[PDB]
Amino acid sequence: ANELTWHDVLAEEKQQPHFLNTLQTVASERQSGVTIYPPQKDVFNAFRFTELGDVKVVILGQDPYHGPGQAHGLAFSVRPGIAIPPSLLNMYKELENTIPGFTRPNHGYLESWARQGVLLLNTVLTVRAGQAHSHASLGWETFTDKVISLINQHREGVVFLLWGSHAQKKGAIIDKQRHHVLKAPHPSPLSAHRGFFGCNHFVLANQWLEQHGETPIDWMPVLPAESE
Numbered sequence: 053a054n055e056l057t058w059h060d061v062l063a064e065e066k067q068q069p070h071f072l073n074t075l076q077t078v079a080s081e082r083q084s085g086v087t088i089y090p091p092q093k094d095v096f097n098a099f100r101f102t103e104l105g106d107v108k109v110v111i112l113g114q115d116p117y118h119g120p121g122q123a124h125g126l127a128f129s130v131r132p133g134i135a136i137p138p139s140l141l142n143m144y145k146e147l148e149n150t151i152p153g154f155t156r157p158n159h160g161y162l163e164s165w166a167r168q169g170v171l172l173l174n175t176v177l178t179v180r181a182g183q184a185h186s187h188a189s190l191g192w193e194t195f196t197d198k199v200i201s202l203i204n205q206h207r208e209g210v211v212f213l214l215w216g217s218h219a220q221k222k223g224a225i226i227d228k229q230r231h232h233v234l235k236a237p238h239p240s241p242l243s244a245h246r247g248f249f250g251c252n253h254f255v256l257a258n259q260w261l262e263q264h265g266e267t268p269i270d271w272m273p274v275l276p277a278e279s280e
């Protein structure tokens with residue numbers, strides 16, 4: 053497939069009602085004082101780090117971290133000066149019981165992940181504060197719905213790490229004769245203990261990449277950049 057940038061593919065979408073009437077729901081409450089995660093400039097951050105073309109894997113969570121300084125737009129990632137929260141911890145656990153000689157990192161910044169076709173995504177792009185979901189009745193599920201579709205429509209043989217019931221629907225529109233699709237109960241300490249922990253998404257994905265010529269994913273995160 054030709055080189056189609058999200059700019060290309062999102063367009064119309066951007067320029068659409070349902071969506072617009074979701075930014076509005078958004079802009080608004082942030083405006084009523086109410087603290088919302090993540091700041092607006094971070095909202096689509098994902099699409100920023102990993103472009104549709106370079107899309108190799110898709111991790112689909114659904115509503116960001118409702119903590120202060122947590123959420124930065126990368127489905128499950130945090131910036132460097134932040135402490136790995138339950139969810140990532142658990143990820144890591146899996147990145148322990150399954151990968152070779154993997155030792156969690158001492159950070160929760162998954163930029164590297166992203167830079168390697170990993171579509172660290174969520175269904176609900178924004179959220180109240182310390183209040184789960186609390187924002188799942190707007191055009192959020194509708195946006196992401198298309199996002200997948202677009203992905204689907206395009207780029208062949210993609211593994212969809214679909215974590216949680218919610219994430220599991222809004223991704224179960226994918227033609228499997230053409231894409232790979234896995235199911236794991238949310239990593240979150242509220243659900244992890246139901247199968248997440250046991251799933252093999254990581255390897256099981258690095259396999260799919262293997263057998264189609266695709267370079268596996270370095271699940272070992274890194275905090276680069278240094279100079280005088």
Ligand SMILES: O=c1cc[nH]c(=O)[nH]1
Nearest residue numbers: 113114116117127128
């Ligand atoms: O990106 C994130 C952060 C918290 N919980 C999720 O499901 N995704």
